[PDB]
Structure formats: structure tokens, C-alpha cells
Amino acid sequence: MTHDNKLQVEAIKRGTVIDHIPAQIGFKLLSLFKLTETDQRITIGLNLPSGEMGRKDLIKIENTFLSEDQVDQLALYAPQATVNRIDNYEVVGKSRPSLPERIDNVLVCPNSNCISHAEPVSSSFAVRKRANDIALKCKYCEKEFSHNVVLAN
Amino acid sequence: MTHDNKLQVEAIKRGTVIDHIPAQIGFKLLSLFKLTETDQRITIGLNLPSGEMGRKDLIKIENTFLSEDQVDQLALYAPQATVNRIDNYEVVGKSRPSLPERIDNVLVCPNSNCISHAEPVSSSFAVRKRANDIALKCKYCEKEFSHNVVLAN
Amino acid sequence: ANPLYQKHIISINDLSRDDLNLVLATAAKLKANPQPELLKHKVIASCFFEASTRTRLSFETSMHRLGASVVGFSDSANTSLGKKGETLADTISVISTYVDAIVMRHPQEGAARLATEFSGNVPVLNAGDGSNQHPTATLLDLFTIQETQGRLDNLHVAMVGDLKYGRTVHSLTQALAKFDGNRFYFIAPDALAMPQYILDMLDEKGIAWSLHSSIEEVMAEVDILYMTRVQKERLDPSEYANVKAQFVLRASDLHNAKANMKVLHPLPRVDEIATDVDKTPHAWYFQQAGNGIFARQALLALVLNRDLVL
Amino acid sequence: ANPLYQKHIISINDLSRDDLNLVLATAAKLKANPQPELLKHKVIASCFFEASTRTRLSFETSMHRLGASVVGFSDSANTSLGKKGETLADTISVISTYVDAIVMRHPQEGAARLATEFSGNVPVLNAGDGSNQHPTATLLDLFTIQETQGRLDNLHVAMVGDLKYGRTVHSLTQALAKFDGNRFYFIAPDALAMPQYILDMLDEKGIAWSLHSSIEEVMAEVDILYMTRVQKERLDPSEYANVKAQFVLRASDLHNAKANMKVLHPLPRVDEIATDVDKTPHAWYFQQAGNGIFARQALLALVLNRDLVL
Amino acid sequence: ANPLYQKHIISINDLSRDDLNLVLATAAKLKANPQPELLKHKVIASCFFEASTRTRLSFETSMHRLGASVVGFSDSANTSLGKKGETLADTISVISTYVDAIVMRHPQEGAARLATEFSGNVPVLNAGDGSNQHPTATLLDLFTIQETQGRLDNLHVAMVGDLKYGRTVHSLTQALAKFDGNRFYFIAPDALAMPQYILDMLDEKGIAWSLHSSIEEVMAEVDILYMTRVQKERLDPSEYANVKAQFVLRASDLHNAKANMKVLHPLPRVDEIATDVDKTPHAWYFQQAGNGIFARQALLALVLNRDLVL
Numbered sequence A, B: 001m002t003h004d005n006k007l008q009v010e011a012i013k014r015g016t017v018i019d020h021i022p023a024q025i026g027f028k029l030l031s032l033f034k035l036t037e038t039d040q041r042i043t044i045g046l047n048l049p050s051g052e053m054g055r056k057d058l059i060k061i062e063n064t065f066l067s068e069d070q071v072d073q074l075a076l077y078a079p080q081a082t083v084n085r086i087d088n089y090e091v092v093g094k095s096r097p098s099l100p101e102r103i104d105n106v107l108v109c110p111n112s113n114c115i116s117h118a119e120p121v122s123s124s125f126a127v128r129k130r131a132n133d134i135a136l137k138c139k140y141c142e143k144e145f146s147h148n149v150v151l152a153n
Numbered sequence C, D, E: 001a002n003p004l005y006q007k008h009i010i011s012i013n014d015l016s017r018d019d020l021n022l023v024l025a026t027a028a029k030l031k032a033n034p035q036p037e038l039l040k041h042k043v044i045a046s047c048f049f050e051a052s053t054r055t056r057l058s059f060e061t062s063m064h065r066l067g068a069s070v071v072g073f074s075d076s077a078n079t080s081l082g083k084k085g086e087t088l089a090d091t092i093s094v095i096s097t098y099v100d101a102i103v104m105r106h107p108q109e110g111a112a113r114l115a116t117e118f119s120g121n122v123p124v125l126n127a128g129d130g131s132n133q134h135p136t137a138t139l140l141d142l143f144t145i146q147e148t149q150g151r152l153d154n155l156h157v158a159m160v161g162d163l164k165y166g167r168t169v170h171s172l173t174q175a176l177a178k179f180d181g182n183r184f185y186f187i188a189p190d191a192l193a194m195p196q197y198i199l200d201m202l203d204e205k206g207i208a209w210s211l212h213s214s215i216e217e218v219m220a221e222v223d224i225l226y227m228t229r230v231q232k233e234r235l236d237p238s239e240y241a242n243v244k245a246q247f248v249l250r251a252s253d254l255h256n257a258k259a260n261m262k263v264l265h266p267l268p269r270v271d272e273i274a275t276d277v278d279k280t281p282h283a284w285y286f287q288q289a290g291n292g293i294f295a296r297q298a299l300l301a302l303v304l305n306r307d308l309v310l
């Protein structure tokens, strides 16, 4: 039931459909959350128009189901985006990434003298809506950074 | 013109269409080809079925036509790929990647003691089909490597 | 079981005004009537991967004052971690199967936090982790502060020196922010200014703070002058301009000094506090040092002993 | 203009059989008919970023014999590339605006090739780039092989020692493969074996080559025994097992050798050749060294002179 | 005798406008009319107690081009001043009984001036004394500015980088102040600002100069953009915050620049000029380098020749 404007086949049984991802984001989300390292059928649509959502982005992973845990972690890059639960062609569910309280294994603490870089542990940051931006606080070194300076993998 | 063979197919007017991209390679070319820059309705299809060939990845970029070299550089990461020049919903030109004589810039010389690392110069290797693997000779240190080793840049 | 029993003491940010008041009250009872065998039969690991004179020696003296035994190292050079490439995680893994509690100082931020993740049931007491926290120092500062001001609420506190790298001021500033009406005055060079996260925490709780270019600019309205050393060993090369102390405190500077105001310093001091201050009734850093014994005995008593000392 | 006029001498792999023959012929003439002013008014830069005795000294001596002026450095420690962080590209870019030719030895393979991209019309002569090529060495070896055997065809040649890191044998082999019917015997430790790229080339040309675990196996068949030094400065820690010479030549092992066989060595020798070999008609390494003067004058003469008539 | 015959070239501050003009005129002639024997039979000492590539090599090259002999050392590590404790005065006293002129670069300001007091009739040419003067550099810059602008008057010149430790800009500025209507633009970090003694001099002469925090502010007005390297080896630990280049020139920042503006740099460049600037009509640092041969031959010719007629 997508839309209309010159046909092309594109519909799947079960799986997830992250929708309304802002420009130059669909690629990032694909890399960070390794949402591509799978045997499942994926169909990324980049830049495809959507009214107010002028140049939106789209990702569809077949047979793959996210979790309140995962979905929320998207609120850090594509907050407005909407995650649609498609089971048997029918859109059985529909959520929206809300700010999670802690991101794990993804980012890397910008503090170079952080014990987390040397030892065999997984990174972790407490998320906080500071003022203009989101502040990230390392569980270990306890320093906080604008969610913008923090890098990842 | 027509409608593809398998189900989920995406349509476009003019642009390029890389097909037969091996599994787990589609997302990579998307990286070291900086295709994700062009804000042109890009369409990626990961892990699509490939008849007796198993599974293929497939990229589609409208109003974009690969460089006078990219197809040759594309010959290394995915030899059995095909690049279709599609103008006005029609294949006005079909191509197959051909191994060039030498490849410049993209590759990094595996020899650590090669001067190409420390100094400000573009790398370049002389390509040469050997026995099954491609042999690359560094323009600088003159050492020859197996493209297997080299593709660890 | 008292609140802090078997509890890890990594950051003052994890404790509450209650946990602190408990430690201090206990500190005062133990100073009054010592308990020589309270920790009889306990073996504590004293693991310092970074230099120390007061923290380690006071800590270890405290363990003995309470009858406990001490094992450990004062330098990582001869540990297997120092010569055999062993990770901190594995070190704390095997160590935690020998002793009842672990006290550790380390050069990297978060080291103590990391230990709690591999220490099994054994508690970890942070004796200093890089430029992050230093809980037990703060615990003795508060003890000393209350001992000299009568209270910990509504105080005019000035912290001079390297606030950026001073793990002591990080902890202390968070501690006093748990009490009410404390007025802060930060006097540090620009490159070594108090970190943002601390200032934000201050704003949120509506606490009042202000920057000042000189000691004299606040000498008349401060109850506690908390002097610190420039963390030379932690500075980046691009900050070597601040290796020497910009604010040196001299006796003459204590003329317009409030009679009750004391001068504190977590130590060691280099040249930021001239020796003449030593014999003025305002100097209290050596008294402060001595209190580390009571604050550290108190802390150990609560973590390794179930019942609130009788 | 002669074939080599203004050409860069970087890798033997870029010279043809006729180019090599032209240098040897010329070397022959200069060795018997000196040209004290052939290069009067030229200034040549002798730039060695790595140790050297024979190559640098023989090269600069050849320049003076031909009336040229020498300028340069034998240690990069005092250049601005050494103390100021300047890149090699910039060093070559400015130096090339001062001199007429550049002789260069560098620790990294490819340094000479790189120089040609920044030297403008100024030709670059590769005195050695890491473990890659050593062109002028091969020219003096060829000259020496030819004067002792009267030919560069159908020779039975054995190369002993570190063949992996030996730029000398890398260039010498590609040269001898340009002639006909030469048979190669490679005696080296597995870890320091001859690179594959050179062997693929030998096969490509249908040249007969074989491996042997001892010198005694081939002693009665070689016309030239080429001894090399284990390239210690280039060894990888994982190869420190081969620093000691595996194959050592003593005077006794020469009993069943062809009367016309000569023992060659690029030098310096460490322990691979006993000094008692020095007093035998076979030892020719020092004569080979002296020939460096003639081979190198020829090259300089041909590169800086459009027309040469001797 | 020409004005400069036998004079010491120590500081630009001791040369007049006519002396400078005499060197440039001569440089012009030698650049077009070579004098291969102008200095036949002279021996010049090239004494560098500090690193160098352009200055030493260009100087010695110029000596050979003019038929002189060179003698000296590029590293004081092996002189007797280096291993035996000999003073500089004694080094210059004996050396001056061997040679006809002395070219010297030293780590401490004033080393050249000192040499003149111990060299007798032997003239001393200052190739650089610490962060003080760099006379021959300024001569080649002037020559280069003049050939690209056809004048040394009413030029809009900007000097960027480390102006405090840059002997190059110290000498270049005192020179350009000897001409008329030149306007100076100084862009440098506060810590590495232009010394006051030079500015007092500019004011004294009523010369227009101004400071700017970016290159973009003056890009469309300069005729010469003089880029310098941060003098790391001379920085004080308290200045290690400025080792990294603050002002970096890239090819893009050149869009609104005068068509005739040239980018100059004494070299070596570290990161202050992106290499993409190299391919633009504005880049002229390498041409400037080559001009060092002509400026320096002229100086040598004028100092060692009573009468010169070219």
C-alpha cells in the first residue's frame, strides 16, 4: 500500500520496515547496528520522496524483528523515524524510537585514557537530554560528551 | 524495455544498474565508491535470489553513470558483475568489467617498508592475470602480491 | 546489615547524603573508641598501579588498626600485569579469589569500575582512578570540614588549582552538592577549569557557583580554602604552560581571612602553598591528612562488617 | 644522444640488454682511456640516507676522476628532512633545482622511483632503495663477470646467502636473465629464499634454475659463486634465527672448483667468507670492488653526455 | 673595491638599501651569465652546527659553480668542539687561518657576530644564528619577490606563522623596511607574535603594519604571502601548545587572490601549506629555493672579489 507513481514490485510477508529515516542516515544505521550482516533480504531505498518528509530514507529487513531495546537506540540518529511491524503483509505493529537510557557496544569513549580502550569490556553510555543536544556519559571514566563528538563502530 | 524476471523489482528512467554483485559485497561497493553521496533515488537489494547462482546483491542509482575507471576497479571486488546503462527505462548499453592494466589510488601496498606509505603520492599497481588469482605489482617497491593479500587495505 | 555492607565504593556520584553521613558518624565513633580486632581474620589487597604516600599508607595503617592483614603491591612493575602482558581484568579476577576486599589506585579513568565487573563478590574500594574519582579522599575532607566548621550545610567553599584533572575536587564538589546552601568559588586557569558535567550537575540542583581570577577576590567570604596541586603527570604537552602554579598562597594573604576559615590541601603540595602558611592557625592540611585514618577505618568497617559497629 | 642520455637508473628491470652492453663497453674504454674533464662544470648530489662505504665513495671518486663537483650528505640526521620533518618529495624537489644529477641510497624500497617524480629533468641514479634494486652494483658485477669469463652467456652462476633481502642479487639476476643460456643455482635459507616474483620471471623466460642446500653440491660446476651478506638491518624479529651465516665458504671447499671460477661478493662480508679464501686465485671480491669506479664513471658519462666518442 | 668586498654578512640590519640592490643586480647577471672560474683557488669553510638542506647545499653548490673549493662539517658532533670541549672562539680562530671565507649556521643567536671577532681578515657569512638573523635567506627572497613583482616598493606583504622564532621573517622585514611604501600584514599566534624590537623599528620609520587573525582577511590584497614553519626546535615547553600550524593554506583559499600574488616559504614546510597549493600558479616556494643559488653566488662573488665586471 506504499504509494503510486510508475510501478515496480516491492512487498514482503513478515519482517520490519524502518521508515522515515532522514537523508544520509540509512547508510549509517546499516553500518552501526550491523543491520546488514544477515542472510535475510533487505531493500534500502535512499532519497525516495515523502511530502513533508521530503527526501526520506527507507530500510526493509525481511524475517528480522527489532526490540524495544533496538528500536529505541535509533532515537539517537533518526528520532522521528517510525518502525513498522509487518507480519504476513499486514502491518501488525507500529512504534517510534524513544530515547533509551544507555547505549552499549556501539560507540567508543572519546577519552583516550579511558580503561575501556585497553581491557576486554563493552562500552556503555548513559543517555541524557542535556539541553540543545543529547549528552552521553561513559560508564567507566564517567566523563560526558555531546552525543555528536562520540564515535562508534 | 520490460519488467524483470523475479518479484520485487525497482524501476527508473536513466542511470546505472550494477547487477550480479556477490553476497556481502553490495554494501561494500556502496562504501568505497561513495555512491551514497549522490542524493539520487538509490535502490539497493541485498541477498536477492540468483537462480542457480544462489544470492546476489543489486544496486541502482538514477542519473548517475559510473566513472571511466570504476568499472575496471569494479572488476576486482566483483568480476562476475554487470553494469547496465539505462536511459529512458531502457538498457541503452550493457557492459562487463574488464581487468585494467594498472589500478591507481584505491589500493594500499602490503609491504610496510614501501615508500608509498610515508610520502604524499598515489599508489598504483600493475595488474596481471596469473593462474587463478590476480597479481599486483607495486609501482614503487616493485614487489608483487596476490590480490587476496592486497585486498586488506 | 548497614547500608554500605559489601558495597563497592567507586564514585561519590553513587553515594547519597545518607551514606556519607553514616561514614562520618562512624568515623567519629572510631576516633573516639578504637576497635583493634574489628577486622580480625580479614585479608585486604592493597593494589596501587600509580604512586602514593598518604592514600596507601593511611589505608594500610587503617587495616592494621582494625586487625586486618594486608597483601599487595605498590608498583605494577613486578606484577605479572607489568611483565607478562596480563590484562587488568584477569588480574582482578584471580586476586578476587584470595582476599576479602580490594583497594586500588590506577592511572586510567574507570579502572575501579572495571574491577567490580570481575571481582565477584569481593568489594572494590577506589583509591583513585586517573582524573576521575577519589571517594575516600573526599570522605576524609568532609570529615575534616565538619570537624572544623561544625557543619557541611551552607558553607562558602573555594577550590583553587587544577580543577580539570583534580580527581579530589571532582569527588568533593559532588559530595558538598548533596548538602544544602553551599556556595562554591572556582579559581583555576582556563585550560584547567572545572569540567562541564560538574557545573551542569550544579546548575540542575540550583547550586550557586562563580569563577574568580584571584584568591584575594574571595578570601574574606570563604570558610574552606581547598588548594590543589597541578596534575603535572596528567597534563597534555599542549598544557605545559600551566605546569607551574598560578595561584600561590602566602601567609600575608590570610589577613582578611575569616577567623574560622581553614586551608585544606589533599596533598602533596608543591609550591602552591608557601611554607609560612604552615604555622598560621589557618593551615589544616596536615590535620586533614591525619583524619584519613579515621575516615578510612570507618569505610572499611562498614564494607566488611555487617553490623553497625557496637 | 646515446640511449641512456638523461635516463633515470632506477631498476635493472627498466634497462635492456643493449643498455647494459653499452655501459660495459664504455666502462672498458674509460678503464683504459681516462677522461679527466668529461664532466667539467657539472655538480652532482650524493645523497645517502643509509650507511655506505663502497657505493658512496666509489661514486664520488668517479665524479672527481671525471672532473665533476660533488655535493650532499652521508647521513640524513642533519638534513632538514631529519630534524624538521620535511618529506622526501620536498627534499628532492629543491635539491633538483641545484644539481645536474642525483645519486641516492634510501632505507625504503621505492624511494628512488619516487624521486624521479619530483626531480624534473634532473636524472636520478638509484644507489640502493631498501631491499629492492641496486642497479649500479649489478653493472659493476656484470663488468667483473665479463672480464673474468669473457662472456655473459651460458654461465653457471650460484647465488648464496640472503636472497630475500639482497637487492644486489635481485638486480643481478634480472640482468643475467637478459642474456642467453645462463643457469642459476640458488643456495639460501628457506626464510631468506629468493622472492617469487623473480622466479616467475625466470620461468617466464624458460631459464634453468634450481635450489640446493649446500655449496659443495655445486662447487664443481659454477663459473661464478656469488656470496652475499645476511641483511640483518632488514630482518624481521621473526627471522632473527638467520642472522648467523648458514653457508660459510672456506679455502678448503674450493678444491674441486673450475680453474676459472671466481668468488664474487657485493661486500661487506661478515663471516660468510673465511679470510683464508682471500689468498686463493678464486677470490675476486676486491677486484670486483675496484671495478666499481669504472662501471660508475661510465654510467655518469652516458647519462650526462648526449654524445660520447671514446 | 665594491661596497661588500671583504665585509661580514651578519645581520640585514647592517646592510643598506644600496648593498641589497647590489646583490640583487649581480644575482641577475650571474643567473644569465655564469662565471665558472670567478673564485678559482679559493677555499671556503661551510660550518653548520645545526641541521640544513637548502642553505648548506645551495651554498656549497654556488661555491662549486664559481670554481671554489669547499671544506667543513655538517654536524658538530665530530669536531673537537663537539668531543673535546673546545670553545667556539678557538674553533673560529684556527679555521680562519685555513680558509678564505666562512659560512656558518649555529643554534645560538649571536654566534656569527662572535666569529667576526676571532676570524681576522677572513669574512664571515651568517647562514643562521638561532632565531636571530638569516641574511642570505632574505637576499634570495628579495631576489624572488623582485622577479615576480618587478619591484620592492609599495608591495602588500603578509607574513604568516611563527614570527617570534623565525629568523627568516626577522631579516626579511628589516630589509623590506628599507624600501618605500611597503605594507605589512602579520598573521601569527599571540605566543609567536613578531618581536617588539622589529615593530618599534617599523613605527620609527612610519611604515604601515597591522595584525590579523586569519589569512582570508587579507587574501585579496597581498602581493606576497610569506608562509613560515613553526620553529619547534626553538619553542619553550610553555609554548608547546603552538607546535601545530594554526594557519594552514589550502588551494581553495586562493580563489579571491590577486592574479600576480605568489606564495613564498623559506622551507621546509610541515603542514602549513597543503600540497594541493603546489599545483597553482601562486605556489612559488620551489622557484624561490632555486633562486638561492643565484643570490648566494652573488654574495660570494662580491665579498671575495674587489672589482667585479659582468
Ligand SMILES: O=C(O)C[C@H](NC(=O)CP(=O)(O)O)C(=O)O
Residues within 6 Å of the ligand: C051, C052, C053, C054, C055, C056, C128, C137, C167, C168, C229, C266, C267, C268
Ligand atoms: O596527587 C594529587 O595531587 C591528587 C591526589 N593525591 C593524593 O591522593 C594524595 P597521595 O598520592 O599521597 O595518595 C592523587 O591523585 O593522588
Ligand SMILES: O=C(O)C[C@H](NC(=O)CP(=O)(O)O)C(=O)O
Residues within 6 Å of the ligand: D051, D052, D053, D054, D055, D056, D128, D134, D137, D167, D168, D228, D229, D266, D267, D268
Ligand atoms: O650490503 C650488502 O651486503 C650488499 C650491498 N653492499 C654495498 O652496497 C657495499 P657499500 O654499502 O659499502 O656501498 C648493499 O646492498 O648495500
Ligand SMILES: O=C(O)C[C@H](NC(=O)CP(=O)(O)O)C(=O)O
Residues within 6 Å of the ligand: D080, E051, E052, E053, E054, E055, E056, E128, E134, E137, E167, E168, E228, E229, E266, E267, E268
Ligand atoms: O627552518 C625554517 O623553517 C626557516 C629557515 N629554513 C631554511 O633555512 C631551509 P634549510 O634549513 O633547508 O637550509 C631556517 O631559518 O632554518
Ligand SMILES: [Zn+2]
Residues within 6 Å of the ligand: A109, A110, A111, A114, A115, A116, A138, A139, A140, A141, A142, A143, C110
Ligand atoms: Zn570512558
Ligand SMILES: [Zn+2]
Residues within 6 Å of the ligand: B109, B110, B111, B114, B115, B116, B138, B139, B140, B141, B142, B143, D110
Ligand atoms: Zn609498494
